[PDB]
Amino acid sequence: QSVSRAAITAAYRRPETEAVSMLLEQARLPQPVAEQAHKLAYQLADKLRNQKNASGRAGMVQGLLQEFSLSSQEGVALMCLAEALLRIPDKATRDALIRDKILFVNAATWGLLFASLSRSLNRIIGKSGEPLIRKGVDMAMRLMGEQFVTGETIAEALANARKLEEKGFRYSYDMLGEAALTAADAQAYMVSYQQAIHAIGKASNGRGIYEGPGISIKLSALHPRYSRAQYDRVMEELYPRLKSLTLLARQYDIGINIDAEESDRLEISLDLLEKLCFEPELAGWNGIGFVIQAYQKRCPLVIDYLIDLATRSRRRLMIRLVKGAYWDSEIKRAQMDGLEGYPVYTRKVYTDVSYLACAKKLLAVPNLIYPQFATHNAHTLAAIYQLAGQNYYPGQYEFQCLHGMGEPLYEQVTGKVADGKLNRPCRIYAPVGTHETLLAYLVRRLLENGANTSFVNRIADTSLPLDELVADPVTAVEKLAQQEGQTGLPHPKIPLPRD
Numbered sequence: 001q002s003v004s005r006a007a008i009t010a011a012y013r014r015p016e017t018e019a020v021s022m023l024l025e026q027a028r029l030p031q032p033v034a035e036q037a038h039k040l041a042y043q044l045a046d047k048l049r050n051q052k053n054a055s056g057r058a059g060m061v062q063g064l065l066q067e068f069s070l071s072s073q074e075g076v077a078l079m080c081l082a083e084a085l086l087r088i089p090d091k092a093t094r095d096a097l098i099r100d101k102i103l104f105v106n107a108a109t110w111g112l113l114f115a116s117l118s119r120s121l122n123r124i125i126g127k128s129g130e131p132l133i134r135k136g137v138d139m140a141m142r143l144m145g146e147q148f149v150t151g152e153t154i155a156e157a158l159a160n161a162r163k164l165e166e167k168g169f170r171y172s173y174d175m176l177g178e179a180a181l182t183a184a185d186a187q188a189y190m191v192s193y194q195q196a197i198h199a200i201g202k203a204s205n206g207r208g209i210y211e212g213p214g215i216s217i218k219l220s221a222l223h224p225r226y227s228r229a230q231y232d233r234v235m236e237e238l239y240p241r242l243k244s245l246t247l248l249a250r251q252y253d254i255g256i257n258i259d260a261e262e263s264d265r266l267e268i269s270l271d272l273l274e275k276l277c278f279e280p281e282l283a284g285w286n287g288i289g290f291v292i293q294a295y296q297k298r299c300p301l302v303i304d305y306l307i308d309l310a311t312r313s314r315r316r317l318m319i320r321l322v323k324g325a326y327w328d329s330e331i332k333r334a335q336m337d338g339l340e341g342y343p344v345y346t347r348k349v350y351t352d353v354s355y356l357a358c359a360k361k362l363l364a365v366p367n368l369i370y371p372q373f374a375t376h377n378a379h380t381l382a383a384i385y386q387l388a389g390q391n392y393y394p395g396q397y398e399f400q401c402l403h404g405m406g407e408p409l410y411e412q413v414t415g416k417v418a419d420g421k422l423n424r425p426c427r428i429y430a431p432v433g434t435h436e437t438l439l440a441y442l443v444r445r446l447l448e449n450g451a452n453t454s455f456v457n458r459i460a461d462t463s464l465p466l467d468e469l470v471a472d473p474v475t476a477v478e479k480l481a482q483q484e485g486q487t488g489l490p491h492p493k494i495p496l497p498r499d
């Protein structure tokens with residue numbers, strides 16, 4: 001194998017204490033940079049919470065709830081009398097009433113500022129059955145998934161883009177659908193991507209790979225049963241499709257990004273990337289995109305490979321750095337194979353340290369990589385902004401975020417300094433499709449929003465202080481090493497696969 005390639009295979013499942021200890025010093029921000037990252041992260045997160053004055057509103061609740069000292073339900077019943085007294089139009093009537101004589105409709109809305117259904121459930125199922133089950137699951141899937149979808153068709157989504165593109169946001173469009181099971185399914189996904197490239201290209205109109213929209217694709221949509229697909233069949237069947245779409249994105253000069261999926265396909269996607277990058281028809285073109293997952297132990301080794309690849313094939317690569325979306329499934333997979341170890345980290349803070357270390361690796365080679373830092377975590381953003389150094393220029397890097405999750409945070413980021421933003425561009429990942437293609441994406445978003453470890457989850461918990469929410473991962477890791485006795489131990493509730 002190649003020297004860069006061999007090192008990747010060597011790190012597939014390396015001990016977690018080993019991996020974390022190596023990344024730790026590459027991820028440590030120097031004390032001056034670290035404090036500036038702290039301030040900016042604190043500001044971003046504070047404005048995200050006290051947006052509708054959610055923080056200070058809870059303060060006046062706790063204050064009057066102290067002085068008067070009654071139930072939380074008692075406080076809500078007080079607001080209801082207060083609101084109905086404020087609805088008395090004449091003051092002299094209201095006050096004389098307060099002293100002479102002395103409805104709960106909006107107590108619901110007031111409660112938010114402060115088991116019998118289980119009977120209905122067991123009851124409803126018996127008479128209704130697997131039809132009721134399959135309908136309700138579909139129903140909640142559409143209802144929860146609306147917020148994550150840009151449009152049902154490529155044309156409806158291109159239209160939805162202008163509002164934010166006029167403010168300096170970019171877009172990457174994703175035609176939903178993945179893990180093709182039949183040659184037909186893969187063929188159809190091939191069609192909907194070509195149709196999308198045309199639409200997004202006519203829309204782009206020469207704006208170019210950096211400043212115009214682009215497209216994101218999944219190899220697993222392009223080949224039947226990609227899960228266990230063999231090497232020779234993938235190159236004969238998938239690669240010509242990957243080539244074709246990429247040629248097409250070049251003619252329109254739009255970025256085309258290869259999404260990263262489950263970790264046992266990292267090898268094969270590198271093989272496809274390696275061949276794509278030496279097509280003569282793509283020589284001198286820099287529009288090829290590739291996601292790397294910082295939660296994998298071999299991400300730093302992939303970066304060394306990609307850096308060498310960009311040199312050998314004489315192009316600048318567009319590399320989306322992400323943490324990763326399949327962590328639950330990666331762990332359950334590794335636990336069932338009883339394999340040597342895990343390919344991903346087992347403590348969330350380890351992934352953050354991985355991400356910070358990989359970001360520095362990417363920022364050091366602007367001639368060979370255009371970094372695209374995908375994240376919704378205020379501290380992560382703040383740290384990359386500091387790590388990228390003074391004297392920003394547009395093509396140095398960009399941020400990325402998911403439709404439905406990133407806009408509140410990046411609206412402090414993309415925009416003019418005069419209007420109080422950071423003047424850094426953000427590309428919004430924009431899914432496109434109907435109900436029939438939303439399931440796997442939605443589930444991954446439910447796993448993301450619902451985890452106690454996720455930034456977007458903890459920012460909502462106004463009982464968690466901002467200083468803990470934006471705390472520094474290197475320091476977190478070193479605080480554990482000192483309490484536990486050694487740097488980088490696996491998560492306690494997650495033993496090694498064979499145990």
Ligand SMILES: Cc1cc2nc3c(=O)[nH]c(=O)nc-3n(C[C@H](O)[C@H](O)[C@H](O)COP(=O)(O)OP(=O)(O)OC[C@H]3O[C@@H](n4cnc5c(N)ncnc54)[C@H](O)[C@@H]3O)c2cc1C
Pocket residue numbers: 258259260261291293295320322323324325326327344345346347348349350351352374375376377380400401402427428429448451453454455456491
């Ligand atoms: C625009 C965009 C494109 C993306 N494309 C891809 C892609 O092609 N492939 C892909 O896999 N991901 C991709 N992601 C990432 C994924 O979808 C999540 O959005 C991302 O991981 C969340 O990171 P965050 O820094 O915003 O949140 P943070 O909450 O600070 O990080 C959360 C992440 O930490 C990781 N994590 C959670 N628990 C643990 C644990 N116990 N041990 C170790 N690690 C843990 C998971 O990666 C989790 O998602 C993309 C994200 C964005 C924004």
Ligand SMILES: O=C(O)C1(C(=O)O)CCC1
Pocket residue numbers: 259260261324325429441444445
């Ligand atoms: O991580 C992934 O593969 C993404 C998904 O959830 O489909 C693409 C953007 C996140």
